[PDB]
Amino acid sequence: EVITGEEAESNVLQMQCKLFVFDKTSQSWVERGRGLLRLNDMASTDDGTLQSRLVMRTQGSLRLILNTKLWAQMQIDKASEKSIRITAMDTEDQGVKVFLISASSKDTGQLYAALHHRILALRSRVE
Ligand SMILES: [Cl-]
């Protein structure tokens, strides 16, 4: 029931993409970087999936540019065949921001489904 941070990692997918974050000051998209985006299912000692995370490091420097858990109230939409818009928690404890993930048509489709289905599943987690 508790996330310890030492959960085992099950990589659901890895995809080349560009990450943009919405700048509330300029009302525009700002590129944060490009590289491999990873969706991970984190396993408990009971093989339960305590949470899922989207993690991304920009290529070259490998600086962390996205590291967010998925949550039930998360807002996601397929903005286009090649882009996904999501609300996510930002990297240095900074709050909820709106992101744009840009990738190939095929990766976008698979990613949207993977995230959407996980969000729905999280909503079923009422006791
Ligand atoms: Cl988070």
Residue numbers in the entry: 322 to 448
Show me the paper's own sentences about this structure:
We therefore pursued the structure of the RBD in its unbound form. We solved the structure at 1.61 Å resolution using experimental phases obtained from a platinum derivative, and at 2.1 Å in a second crystal form by molecular replacement. Crystal forms 1 and 2 contain two and four molecules per asymmetric unit, respectively, and aligning these structures reveals variations in the N- and C-terminal residues and in several loops, reflecting the inherent flexibility of these regions. In contrast, the β5β6 loop, whose functional role is evoked below, is highly uniform in structure, suggesting a comparatively rigid element. The strands define a continuous sheet with simple up-down topology, forming an imperfect β barrel that juxtaposes strands 4 and 6 and extrudes strand 5. The C-terminal helix caps the barrel, packing against strands 1, 2, 5 and 6.
RanBP3 is a Ran-interacting protein with diverse roles in nuclear transport. Specifically, RanBP3 enhances the rate of NES export by increasing the affinity of CRM1 for RanGTP, thereby stabilizing the ternary CRM1/Ran/cargo complex in the nucleus. RanBP3 belongs to a class of Ran-binding proteins characterized by one or more Ran-binding domains (RBDs) of approximately 120 residues. As expected, the RanBP3 RBD adopts a pleckstrin homology fold, composed of 7 anti-parallel β-strands and a C-terminal α-helix.
